[PDB]
Amino acid sequence: TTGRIVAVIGAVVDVQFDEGLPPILNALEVQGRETRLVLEVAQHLGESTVRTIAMDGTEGLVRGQKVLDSGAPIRIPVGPETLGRIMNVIGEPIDERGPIKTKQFAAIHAEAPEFVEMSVEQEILVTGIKVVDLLAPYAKGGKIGLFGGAGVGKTVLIMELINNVAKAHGGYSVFAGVGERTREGNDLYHEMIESGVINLKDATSKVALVYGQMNEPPGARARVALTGLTVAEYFRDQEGQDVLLFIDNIFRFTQAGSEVSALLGRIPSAVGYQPTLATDMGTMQERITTTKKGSITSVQAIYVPADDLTDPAPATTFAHLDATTVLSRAIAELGIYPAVDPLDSTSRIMDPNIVGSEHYDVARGVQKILQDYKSLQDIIAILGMDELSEEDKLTVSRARKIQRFLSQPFQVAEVFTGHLGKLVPLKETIKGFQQILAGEYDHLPEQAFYMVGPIEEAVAKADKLA
Amino acid sequence: DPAPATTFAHLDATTVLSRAIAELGIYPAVDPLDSTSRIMDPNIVGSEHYDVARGVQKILQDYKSLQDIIAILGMDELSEEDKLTVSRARKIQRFLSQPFQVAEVFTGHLGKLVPLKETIKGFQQILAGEYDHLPEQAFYMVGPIEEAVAKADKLAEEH
Amino acid sequence: TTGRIVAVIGAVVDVQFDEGLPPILNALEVQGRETRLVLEVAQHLGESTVRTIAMDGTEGLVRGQKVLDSGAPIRIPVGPETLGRIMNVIGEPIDERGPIKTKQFAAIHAEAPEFVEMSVEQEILVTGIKVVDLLAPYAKGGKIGLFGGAGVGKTVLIMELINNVAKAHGGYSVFAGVGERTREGNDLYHEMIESGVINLKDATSKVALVYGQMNEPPGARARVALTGLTVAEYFRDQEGQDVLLFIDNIFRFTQAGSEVSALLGRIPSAVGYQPTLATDMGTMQERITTTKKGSITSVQAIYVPADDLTDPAPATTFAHLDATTVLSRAIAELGIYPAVDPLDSTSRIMDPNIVGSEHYDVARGVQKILQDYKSLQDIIAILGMDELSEEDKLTVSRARKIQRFLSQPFQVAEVFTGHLGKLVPLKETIKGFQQILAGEYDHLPEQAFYMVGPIEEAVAKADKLA
Amino acid sequence: ATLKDITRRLKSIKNIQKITKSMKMVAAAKLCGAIHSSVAKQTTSEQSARMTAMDNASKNASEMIDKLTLTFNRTRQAVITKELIEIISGAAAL
Amino acid sequence: DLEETGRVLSIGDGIARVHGLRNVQAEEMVEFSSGLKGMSLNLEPDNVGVVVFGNDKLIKEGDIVKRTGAIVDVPVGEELLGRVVDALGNAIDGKGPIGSKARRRVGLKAPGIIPRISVREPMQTGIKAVDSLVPIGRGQRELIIGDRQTGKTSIAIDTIINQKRFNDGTDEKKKLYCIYVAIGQKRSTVAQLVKRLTDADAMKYTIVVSATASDAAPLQYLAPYSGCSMGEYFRDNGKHALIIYDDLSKQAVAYRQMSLLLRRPPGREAYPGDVFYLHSRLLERAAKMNDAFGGGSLTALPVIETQAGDVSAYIPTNVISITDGQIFLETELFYKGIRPAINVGLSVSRVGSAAQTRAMKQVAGTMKLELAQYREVALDAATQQLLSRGVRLTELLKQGQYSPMAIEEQVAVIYAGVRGYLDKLEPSKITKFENAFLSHVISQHQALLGKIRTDGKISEESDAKLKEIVTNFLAGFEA
Amino acid sequence: YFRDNGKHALIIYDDLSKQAVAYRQMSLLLRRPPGREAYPGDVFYLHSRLLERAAKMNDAFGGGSLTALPVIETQAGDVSAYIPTNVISITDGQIFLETELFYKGIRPAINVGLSVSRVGSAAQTRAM
Amino acid sequence: YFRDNGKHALIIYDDLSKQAVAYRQMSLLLRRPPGREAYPGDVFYLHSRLLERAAKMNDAFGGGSLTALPVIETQAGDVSAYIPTNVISITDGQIFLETELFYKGIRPAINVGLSVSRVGSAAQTRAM
């Protein structure tokens, strides 16, 4: 049956049907248009009229324009032929490499795994990053979130994690660009074709790319995540493999939701967001998961608007994570990269029965001395360090070498650090710190532990300083 | 907050409780500097009753002023005159606390009930300087000013 | 065309015109009232009904009461005969000196000069007041933020400026009392009469008064700045003068705006102001600049909310300022008049490319010597003013000569001070301080520079006092 | 951040600020940095150091107050803005 | 006729409700009686909401409305160079009609992933600090953020004025057409701006789109987009452009007015939820095309005004989370005399390195480091030598206004500070030394500068000679 | 009445704060448009017209006067709050009271540094 | 059911905050005006209604019970925020955990300073 547009406001389009009303989520195709314009049915307004959301610009639409009911949600290609390709919200290829001939197609909307499909296996995923490896190890099959403010470190980190992890990965990965910088996809795409994780000739590619950058309208940015998500689900279930799913900024999925919620006729919730922020988010995050049928190690970059971690968006994101890496501008401004907050990043894997007592005991040693140094910062700012006991000065000193020894030069950032990248092993990181704590290096200067790999390179740099 | 701020003018006497005070284990946690009463006039309670009250409140306000000064300096800079009031503030502060018959199950002590006159005397004497030889603890959670000395004694013998 | 009041909700009135509908900003005349009640159009609600904001009480109005479309917006008397007179919001004389017999009339709502009508030359409006002309020059056709509460020389600096600009520039002046207190409004009137700027006898008046009393509704208080603006415009576009516009409390204009906005049921923006904040400030502020014909410079008194410079009101106002004259009790006490702070008052135009390299280096030298002397204060008092090197003893001395030379006797003070006021040309001030800085006048006593005019009167005053 | 808390730290640091500036002068007239520090670990000086110490301490507090106050107003503006949006959402929900 | 027409049902709040126009397209330009133009924003069952591009007080109930049958677009082309127009493209410099023969929608979506390539061509601002520590690349976006009166607008003007040395060349692949959008500023400043540009002989390769404080919100809301389309013209046709949105901060509050007026739910700082999309879509249009798409580009230096240096504010962080770097201008550095007041330690160029000339890379590569060591330590011969370099290099980055340097002269002046021919000199003089040293090299060594301008590198041959030119200058320098 | 008949009257409005509170209630119950602190947009117009009504009339009108003393209850001393702001401006001066000065002993509790009459010495005999 | 059959049940409401969240979302889409931080007017009643059901029945009613340990989440540690104070002013005390004590090594991060039980002694065995 034929539906007709009866109203258009930005990205919300009301379509009235005279016969056969399209159910919610059903994807309607707008007629009379140059490129495919999909509307997603969001609600039944009554009077045979449905309110939808456009997956692309709605410029040019005219009331009375015909809209077709595809009879199903937004279905995208899933399968091995997606690998090495770049697709948009609605699964159309955008890498100028022609149709994506997959057998199966998949709806980008699906129910999350049931409670009986849940996995309880915890097994660390060492990353080579001392701060993450140490204080809040990532977990294979786990949900890693990387919170960070504008320009703090999310991207570079996700990139390093793709370097230090993805490459040494035996399986398929899915990178979902959501509301970020298009030239970044550009960067990523060409960095992958280089390293070879993407192959344009032989069919050996291992990465599937879904993109809906900050140039896209709210409806897209609001669903791209589900698309990348859906492409990851195929690899997990319909193939039972270990799937890596990177998503640079899932916060954009929520932000986008707010733009359209406005137009949908919803009274706004706290801070202007939509009422459905929590649920909307749940029905998505819950699909990003490991089941008994397969695994998904997801790494999600999370933007903190106005650097406010209490903002409904990020706030609401923590409960969905198995591991959190909180980046701080204050730390970044002291030139500590990655600007990871030693005292606000967590991992369900930070358990002695899981990473050992030596690992756990050092981790807590570090979060204790830094915590104790942090509580002294009040006194240091007013009365300097001449008003601290002899004991205090000692911790302050070890904290400062620990803080710096937490930094690390990543390959993906060599241009800004002016140092060759470093990949530190786990034992080496445990060791390095056990030592700084035990006072073993209380004779070396702070600046010696800054921007270095293992502890050994902390010493080398010390001699050079003489 | 609107709710409480609108409720004040409806009262002829207000007793304000203070987390800060309760936190210093002082009960009732009544704020001495924020609890007021309409009859707090010398021509209704007499001059003796009034003066002591304001005398309490003042030394307690002065003590708040030294809270800061000593917060950076330490207890060894105040002239023997000021550090003297600090030492009385503490005692007057502590003497305002009082065990309740209704709060036995909490404190574990025997609730006391103080007659007015014994209260004024009680604070009249402390402000006088009389009990500057007794330890603060002696005034914490007691009845009339006597138990203070008594407790202070039970305190001397135990040492 | 005649309308009929169909809705009155406080200072808001909706009128229904059966045939001809009055455009937005068009003044309507209420029929059947003792005084004149003007309703300024604000919206076309539809159904031949228009909404408006009353310029005076709305008590007595009845649904059905007749209303007349004045054909255009609020028009007021313009031209010479307005000077010395105190005008109401709508153009009515409120000084009870009868009618304001003018042959001309103008609308309070006029688009700002077009881009071509713009001056591209940066000229400095000489006030004859040393500190002003030397440390914070008044951009001809620029806005200057007058900072300082009351009892600091405000009313005196305002009139003096009126005098000087008149004596050395032929241009008149207008005073828009936005949200004035009837009390100070009265005080100012007579304080001006006894100062010469206003003459109730011979047409020698140099200023036109326009008032917007607090007891007047937000609608009224919002338009005054424009009424007084329209008055000043006549003298710029009709007599090619370089007028001077005084807006005492530009803030209360802003606030006046928000109240209108709210009354009209618009959704406030951050901090409760009107969404239109910047545009309300734009449309008006932009009518103040240098045109091919002449120019209007305006001194607007500013109120910083909660002492917060970032609060919307001021921050929206600082976008339109070229200078700031800061009055200071600290200065007023020392007996230094005008009590203009030589270090807090500033100018955008204080640039070599604009005020000449010469003028620049002088203003800079004076700013730096004061800064140097202001620091020394500590040492001088504590460490004793006995161990001051040669370079340290001259600074303090010279600075003091400068600091006092910054004082100036106003011609409008003659009435009480019993001292001939002085109007220093830019040339004299530059050289005056230029020399003091050299040391040419170090062999003179401080009081020699206190309360004088050109540098000459400094030496002449020195010998007499020996 | 909370207006109640910021207001608490500002007052508290404005106080400290006053007391430290006062000590700098007394010292000037006559904690002393790392003076007692050095000799133990191993007047003119003593006062020198005390002058210096309180001085810096005085600045360090003012630079701190200067930063709290900005946070004060930012946060002051935010609270008003919040209270208002709440007030209107209810009205626009009627 | 209600298929291509409509009467105005109501006009107030800034949005005009039109009856009819049964055939209008969303985002379609429409024309009123008074000649004023609008855009179809909201298509509803019984009316059409029209954003009005201009004074909406001129619209009255009943007014006829007509379809232009077109989605909002603006004139585009080389004929716009040396001109001043308003958001709609209407010339406003009295100089008459525009010889425009092409048009382009202002809302065109930006290039996707495929057609791009990492910036790689220099976007020489002529500013020492910038072109050495925060190197911009053609096609990149570099936010210019700082407080009011910090020097933001200069960073940009000196940049436009710098290009002249390139456009008066022969090779179209090195020229840089410029576009300066004026949003929310005062006409006078614009007036004063082009007049300045004219004197520097910059306006001929410059377009100036203006939507000042007097212009209705929508106009200001729009302006940036129109200037972009014009910039895109050069981008997509193999040419290089540089668009400057002089503060989007004002385009944001202008949008906020329409949002709050259209009753869209207020969020953080009362702004709408889309104040980010507003800036992300616009700025995504700035880009570096690869050879298979023309190889041209569009560099955007947007400006953001912070409140008391609070870069964590809502808008400031949005744009930051869009652009490829920020140039922080500190108020304290400004009133302290450091001009340009570029807080180096905070500023960045996430993509300008590869684009930086090999010349700078050499000297400036070591300079970012020496300023690193200095920023840290700011007795002992070690650190004493670091503080000396620091205050000298710092005075080097000091620069005047309206006088952009040439990339080769920079490496020359910088070359000094890095190798150490300033160690023995005193601070107060380093600037006096510069003006003297630079005017000296320019005059007596066009060759060396020319070989560096031409090799974009300070070869071992150019280096040895540049060492001479500096050593034998210190001698004859009058303290 | 006294102001118009050569007589002088001093009027005290105990907390206009409360009056405003009442006005708002009516405003919001009628559904007018709410603003800062939910107060109607003309709340300022409410106090301005009341406070101006006070005046020192001219000998021609009798010489009578109506002096006003409105009271404003601040919260935690926030004077930068909507109504306090309002009134502060509308009136000619302020006598600031404070708890600290109180329990300290300074009674009445007036802050000589913060309180201010713009009329100053005008109404202060030379003796004073 | 247990509390009404001479048996004792211990209930854990793992996160009333999220519960408050969902409640708000529902109310918002039922078109009831929003409020403080956008929650419903009766968010207080949302929890007070649930927690009262926890109780110690007398022997005439079986003598059973139902004890609750509702868990509340705060942001930036603000026990002084809406919901958080809503519940606190309901339950008979509260156990407060802090991140500060957590890193110092104090696990379980229970800050005695703010943690109380309005039952106190009433709920402890002789020996302990």
Ligand SMILES: Nc1ncnc2c1ncn2[C@@H]1O[C@H](COP(=O)(O)OP(=O)(O)NP(=O)(O)O)[C@@H](O)[C@H]1O
């Ligand atoms: N590991 C790192 N080493 C050195 N510099 C870093 C590192 N991480 C971040 N940075 C710096 O911060 C800048 C940008 O960080 P980036 O990875 O883009 O942040 P982001 O989280 O993605 N922010 P955004 O996307 O704008 O919200 C880089 O240009 C670097 O200067």
Ligand SMILES: Nc1ncnc2c1ncn2[C@@H]1O[C@H](COP(=O)(O)OP(=O)(O)NP(=O)(O)O)[C@@H](O)[C@H]1O
């Ligand atoms: N490189 C420079 N050297 C010296 N002075 C400079 C320089 N750049 C700017 N200025 C001065 O600073 C003033 C204004 O700077 P401007 O370019 O407008 O800064 P802005 O950040 O854009 N502020 P604004 O546009 O007024 O909000 C000018 O009047 C110049 O005198």
Ligand SMILES: [Mg+2]
């Ligand atoms: Mg990123």
Ligand SMILES: [Mg+2]
């Ligand atoms: Mg600027």
